[PDB]
Design a protein around this ligand. Structure first.
Ligand SMILES: CCCCCCCCCCCCCCCCCC(=O)OC[C@H](COP(=O)(O)OCCN)OC(=O)CCCCCCCCCCCCCCCCC
Ligand SMILES: CCCCCCCCCCC1=C(C)C(=O)C(OC)=C(OC)C1=O
Ligand SMILES: CCCCCCCCCCC1=C(C)C(=O)C(OC)=C(OC)C1=O
Ligand code: SF4
Ligand code: SF4
Ligand code: SF4
Ligand code: SF4
Ligand code: SF4
Ligand code: FES
Lengths: 180, 226, 589, 213
């Protein structure tokens, strides 16, 4: 090889060594898990919960839109009805060993009941215990959407909400009324 | 008979109206009040198509395909702009008073009204006023009643009276306060009242026996049986 | 007139040349939304048509794609020849900047086509794939064996009667006999490949480079015939990373297939999302507004910088310097902070939608974009001056696995290799998609030799141009909607869904049954992070894809691998593997 | 509250995994227990991963290897390319049908002690790919110690599963020598993380709105 090439290569190796030394004289870029908590954005798609209305009741009406919108098919539920007439999930199970955390169920929820919270620590020893049930998903608050209630928009009569008491709804006019 | 749909020549039966002739050929026209078994009454005004009498005609006339015979020499347009806007407007007028009830409706995913709202392509709401509401009646152990979802298409009363021969279902009310049901509460004593859950395009009459343990149509595993 | 309209494409001069050559009663022209002239030709004239297209004054020098299609279940075939199966050949002329798609119709019993390997040498793996998944035999093919499935596989998986799900078949039971049978199936047999496993002086060495190798970028294996250290021949064995994503496209709805598009090239993300959603918008007839285009360009350039950072760090690691990968992944974490802020996920965002994106931009994204744009160029210059200007790295890189424009064109090589051969063909400039015409950026080209070093430096310049695009889009972002106003926009905007009944109905029927896209064929070709990514979608008028064909560049690059490294050492192969920019989900799909 | 596994490849058992598991009690000795605690600490505080990768989950795993996460702080960075030198197989990627014999071979080529972490929904159950050419979970034919949901799990979730593996190792019983004592492997039946975190997960009331950052 040429002598100039050898000199250029020697200077290049020296320059690389110098830059890695200045890297040693630089600031550390590590986020110290688990000693400092991991910052997660508010819309981060992690662990799935079922939320409640501001009145304190569960916001899910068991409409099965999340289960069919799930491309993986890892949501199972069954609709039950209370005495007043409101719908709720009798059970609600998600196979988290099968879920891909894509957020299509939250996107497809018309009541904002199912949500993907900023939580990633869901490691398990047995994947049978990764099948979360309704007692593991239902939380005691509204979650990311604080002041939305689906039943204030629905035209179905439940407890505490008679016919015509929803938003943008008129009072029910009987057909026996004297007004023309 | 020979008709011309969107410039395409079709051979149809001249004793049928334009709606069943076009639905037989695979052409999608929105419709509510027409049923193959009950007949044509021209109520919902959803089946509008633009009719021309000549091959060289520009204006035309918006007619009801369910009330227009499929005679020889009719030139109809289904996807003309005026007809599509009128059908979208009919869907919009039906959507002005319809409740926000699809998640808590047993007819969701099996709803003719949902399918026809999607087919006309109406997905934006400009109506900002109130929606009328109705009380519900107890129709017995089989049929659940939810009168807010009605679109006043008169299929239920036509079937129940002019076909099944029942005597306790009818139309009551007025201008836009039409009620469909019984004069009081009680069980529908017709022996064929269960077909109301499939005759009704909306979730007014629903299967209460299915509503006890309810799942959607896509979740159902079906079979042909006797 | 919108660009998604069904164009018959009788104004193309290639159609007129084909009429003047083969006559007016030799082929049919199919009107599609592909933007490409689709010519149904007879099986007997296929090689003559290919030779005529290859011998044009500005010829079609590249075989972009070659694959089959099961038309037995296709109800809407008006204006098409009668066929139980079909084979389509997508060809590109760079000189005309034009494409053509030749389709050959086949009956169910007479499933044989003449081979296309003599005209285009890259047709070998495509024809093996078409035989493996559709059962179509290619007469005259040298070695027609399974390329995605193991050799002891019964049935062809992309046929309509084959079950798509694993739950249809028995659950995977690994026994001793099955392990032995599949191990004998996976054992390399050099007599099948004509490898001639010996010489009078010495014996050849058969080495499995992969699946478990640090140099292999996935689950695949190159079987090397060696003498001493020199490579005599290579058999790149793929099919180990097959997820059946096209059969999955026949199994999911139009909206629910987007996460599966995200995992096709797992370093790409939104770059993988864009061609699929653009083809679906072509099917639906959706013209997205300016803000949607700028946001999608933002996310795809961010993920392009991410993928290029991983590629450069990986190349430097395989050359031997193990330091810059840590800093490059720190920059990847900065990009991941921005992407987590916007989409809510790190690496598979699944954030693009039909007619727009999932959400609007959150309040404060420009702060993180400014942070990344300030953090990046000093780090990139440090990487350059520390490792990319290293004479040992240059010795390991320059002149290693070099090919010209002829080898790049005959093997379907796209991306940085094709531009490193001096051919200035980028999709973002030649066929501009998603409003790339509004951005001022340059296309780096090479000097005519596609070295490892040339491809890496071209990707560095592409990273710098993507930084320029990000700066331009940060300084000018429109204030409009993040979703289109089309009725087929899936899903509709969320607040209108939550408080209007029309929007609730549209959302209910679009997330459950799926959007009904009318029966048409659509095609979108984009410049991916590793080359050219294309989606070809056939809709039957239903809520699910009738056919989803995904063309990827890493398939062509891995098929090019034996022709560019034969006769070299194994170290040159290691540098070539590190300097190709491939992942194996991209190859096997 | 322990499970005992004895393996026998040469015995009459055709289906993988070639092992037998029963539910037993803790066998644990004024010094043998302390020496077992010391070797358990040494094994749990020095875990060497196998440089085996299948798909995107491995890309997030090597993202965890880099400087911005520093899994080297746990002593889990050495990343041997040989199965003999590795102690932990992270199945990080899809368990493809064509690679299940390869995965079984590479698991056979590791040496005692060995632990398995399945990373991602593909490795756990097959995930989104319920397709003809994907094994529905790597636990169909290998025993898996730790499962990580995600697609991909973020790198800190990989280090969380590594810490869960360390907690599992730190209270298990293994043969100290291969010439004296029982050769069966005793693993603890620990309480699941779901029931452990159900108290702090249910009580979550309010989160930050998605329009913020
Ligand atoms: C302590 C003494 C250190 C001496 C070397 C200092 C090198 C400084 C440096 O940054 O050199 C890099 C440079 C690389 O050259 P190039 O890639 O062309 O970039 C042009 C802009 N620097 O390198 C050069 O331009 C090379 C010029 C310096 C050559 C120094 C030769 C010293 C005498 C020979 C020693 C080695 C003999 C080997 C046999
Ligand atoms: C331990 C020090 C940091 C290592 C960082 C490695 C980053 C990725 C290297 C490239 C690579 C990829 C992407 C990869 O996918 C792969 O196949 C599984 C490899 O072989 C093991 C690779 O080497
Ligand atoms: C009984 C003594 C046991 C000593 C074990 C030493 C293990 C190797 C530590 C240093 C090391 C080497 C050599 C190494 O090869 C390596 O890979 C790049 C490292 O980084 C991940 C290392 O940290
Ligand atoms: S995040 Fe996606 S994969 Fe997981 S349950 Fe929801 S829809 Fe299904
Ligand atoms: S989409 Fe929402 S309301 Fe409907 S069943 Fe699922 S969680 Fe319940
Ligand atoms: S009747 Fe149909 S449109 Fe009306 S609430 Fe029920 S599902 Fe919705
Ligand atoms: S109750 Fe049903 S069938 Fe009767 S008019 Fe109303 S929508 Fe029609
Ligand atoms: S779980 Fe998701 S990220 Fe992991 S290998 Fe599967 S597709 Fe890739
Ligand atoms: S279907 Fe014709 S007006 Fe109702």
């Amino acid at each position: 090889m040429t002598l100039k090439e050898l000199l250029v290569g020697f200077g290049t190796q020296v320059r690389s060594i110098w830059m890695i030394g200045l890297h040693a004289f630089a600031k550390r870029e590590t986020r110290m898990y688990p000693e400092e908590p991991v910052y997660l954005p508010p819309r981060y798609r992690g662990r799935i919960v079922l939320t409640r209305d501001p009145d304190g009741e569960e916001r899910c009406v068991a409409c099965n839109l999340c289960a069919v919108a799930c491309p993986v098919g890892c949501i199972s539920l069954q609709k039950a009805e209370t005495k007043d007439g409101r719908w709720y999930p009798e059970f609600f199970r998600i196979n988290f060993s099968r879920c891909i955390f894509c957020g299509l169920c939250e996107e497809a929820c018309p009541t904002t009941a199912i949500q993907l919270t900023p939580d990633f620590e869901m490691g398990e020893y047995k994947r049978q215990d990764l099948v979360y049930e309704k007692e593991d998903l239902l939380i005691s608050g509204p979650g990311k959407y604080p002041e939305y209630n689906f039943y204030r928009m629905a035209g179905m009569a439940i407890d505490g909400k008679d016919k015509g008491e929803a938003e943008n709804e008129a009072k029910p006019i009987d057909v026996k009324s004297l007004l023309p | 008979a020979t008709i011309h749909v969107d410039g395409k020549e079709y051979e149809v039966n001249g004793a049928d109206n334009l709606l069943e002739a076009c639905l037989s050929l695979g052409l999608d026209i929105p419709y509510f009040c027409w049923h193959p078994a009950l007949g044509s009454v021209g109520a919902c005004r959803q089946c509008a198509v633009k009719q021309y009498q000549n091959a060289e005609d520009t204006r035309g006339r918006l007619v009801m395909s369910c009330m227009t015979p499929a005679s020889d020499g009719t030139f109809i347009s289904i996807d003309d702009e005026e007809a599509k806007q009128f059908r979208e407007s009919v869907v919009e007028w039906l959507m002005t008073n319809h409740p926000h009830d699809c998640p808590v409706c047993e007819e969701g995913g099996n709803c003719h009204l949902q399918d026809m709202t999607v087919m006309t392509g109406h997905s934006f709401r400009r109506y900002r006023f109130t929606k009328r509401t109705h009380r519900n009646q107890d129709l017995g152990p089989f049929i659940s009643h939810e009168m807010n979802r009605c679109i006043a298409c008169y299929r239920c009363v036509r079937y129940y009276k002019d076909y099944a021969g029942g005597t306790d279902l009818g139309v009551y009310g007025a201008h836009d306060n039409v009620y469909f049901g019984r004069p009081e509460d009680g069980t529908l004593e017709s022996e064929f009242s269960g077909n109301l859950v499939e005759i009704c395009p909306t979730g007014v009459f629903t299967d209460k026996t299915h509503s006890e343990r309810y799942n959607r149509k896509w979740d159902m595993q079906f079979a042909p049986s006797i | 007139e919108p660009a998604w309209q069904t164009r018959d494409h009788l104004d193309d001069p290639v159609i007129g040349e084909l009429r003047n050559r083969f006559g007016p009663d030799a082929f049919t022209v199919q009107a599609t939304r592909t933007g490409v002239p689709v010519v149904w030709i007879k099986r007997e004239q296929l090689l003559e048509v290919g030779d005529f297209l290859k011998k044009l004054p500005k010829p079609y020098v590249m075989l972009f794609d070659l694959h089959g299609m099961d038309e037995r279940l296709r109800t809407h075939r008006e204006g098409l020849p009668a066929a139980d199966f079909s084979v389509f050949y997508h060809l590109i002329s760079i000189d005309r900047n034009r494409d053509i798609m030749l389709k050959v119709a086949l009956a169910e019993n007479d499933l044989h086509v003449p081979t296309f390997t003599k005209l285009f040498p890259n047709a070998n793996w495509y024809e093996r794939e078409t035989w493996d998944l559709f059962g179509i035999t290619f007469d005259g093919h040298p070695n027609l064996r399974r390329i995605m499935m193991p050799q002891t596989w019964k049935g062809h998986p992309l046929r309509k009667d084959y079950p798509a799900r694993a739950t249809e078949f028995s659950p995977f039971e690994l026994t001793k006999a099955k392990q032995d049978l599949e191990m004998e199936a996976l054992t390399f047999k050099p007599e099948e490949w004509g490898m001639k496993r010996g010489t009078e002086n010495e014996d050849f060495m058969f080495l499995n480079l992969g699946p478990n190798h640090p140099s292999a970028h996935g689950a695949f294996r190159i079987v090397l015939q060696l003498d001493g250290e020199e490579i005599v021949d290579c058999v790149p064995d793929i099919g180990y990373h097959h997820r059946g994503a096209e059969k999955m496209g026949e199994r999911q709805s139009w909206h629910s297939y987007i996460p599966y598009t995200d995992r096709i090239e797992y370093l790409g993300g939104c770059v993988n999302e864009m061609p699929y959603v653009l083809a679906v918008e072509k099917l639906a007839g959706i013209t997205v507004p300016d803000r949607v285009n700028v946001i999608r360009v933002m996310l795809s350039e961010l993920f392009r910088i991410n993928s290029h950072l991983l590629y450069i760090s990986t190349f430097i690691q395989d050359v031997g310097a193990m330091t810059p990968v840590f800093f490059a992944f720190t920059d990847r974490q900065k990009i991941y902070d921005l992407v987590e802020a916007i989409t809510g996920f790190r690496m598979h965002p699944a954030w693009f939608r039909i007619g727009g994106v999932a959400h609007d931009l959150p309040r404060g994204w420009d702060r993180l974009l400014r942070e990344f744009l300030d953090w990046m160029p000093k780090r990139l210059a440090s990487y350059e001056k520390a490792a990319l200007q290293n004479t040992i790295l240059k010795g390991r890189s320059q002149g290693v696995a070099a090919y010209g424009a002829k080898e790049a064109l005959e093997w379907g090589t796209t991306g940085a290799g094709l531009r490193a051969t001096g051919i200035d063909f980028d999709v973002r400039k030649a066929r501009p998609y998603s409003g790339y015409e509004n951005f001022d950026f340059e296309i780096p080209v090479g000097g005519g030799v596609s070295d490892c070093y040339t491809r890496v430096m071209l990707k560095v310049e592409e990273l710098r141009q993507s930084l320029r695009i990000l700066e331009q889009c940060l300084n000018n972002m429109p204030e409009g909607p993040f979703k289109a106003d089309h009725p087929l926009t899936t899903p509709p905007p969320k607040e209108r869904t939550l408080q209007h009944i029309e929007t609730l109905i549209t959302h209910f029927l679009q997330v459950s049954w799926g959007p009904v896209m009318p029966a048409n064929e659509s095609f979108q070709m984009i410049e991916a992070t590793k080359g050219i990514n294309s989606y070809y979608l056939t809709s039957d008028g239903s809520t699910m894809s009738y056919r989803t064909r995904i063309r990827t560049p890493s398939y062509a690059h891995l098929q090019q691998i034996p022709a560019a490294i034969r006769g070299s050492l194994v170290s040159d192969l290691i540098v070539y593997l590190g300097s190709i920019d491939f992942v194996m989900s991209d190859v096997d799909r | 509250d322990y499970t005992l596994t004895r393996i026998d490849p040469n015995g009459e058992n055709d289906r993988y995994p070639l092992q037998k598991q029963e539910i037993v009690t803790d066998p644990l000795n004024v010094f043998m227990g302390k020496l077992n605690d010391m070797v358990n600490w040494g094994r749990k505080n020095s875990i060497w991963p196998y440089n085996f990768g299948l798909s995107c989950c491995y890309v997030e795993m090597v993202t965890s290897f880099t400087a911005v996460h520093d899994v080297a702080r746990f002593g889990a960075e050495v990343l041997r390319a040989s199965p003999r030198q590795a102690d932990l197989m992270v199945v990080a990627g899809t368990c493809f049908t064509k690679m299940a014999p390869v995965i079984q071979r590479l698991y056979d080529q590791m040496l005692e002690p060995k632990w398995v972490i399945s990373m991602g929904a593909c490795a756990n159950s097959g995930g989104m790919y319920d397709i003809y050419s994907v094994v529905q979970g790597v636990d169909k034919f290998i025993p898996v110690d730790v499962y990580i949901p995600g697609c991909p799990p973020r790198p800190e979730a990989y280090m969380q599963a590594l810490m869960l593996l360390q907690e599992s190792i730190g209270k298990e019983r293994r043969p100290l020598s291969w010439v004296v004592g029982d050769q069966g492997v005793y693993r603890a039946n620990m309480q699941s993380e779901r029931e452990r975190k159900r108290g702090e997960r249910i009580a979550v009331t309010n989160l930050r709105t998605p329009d913020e950052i």
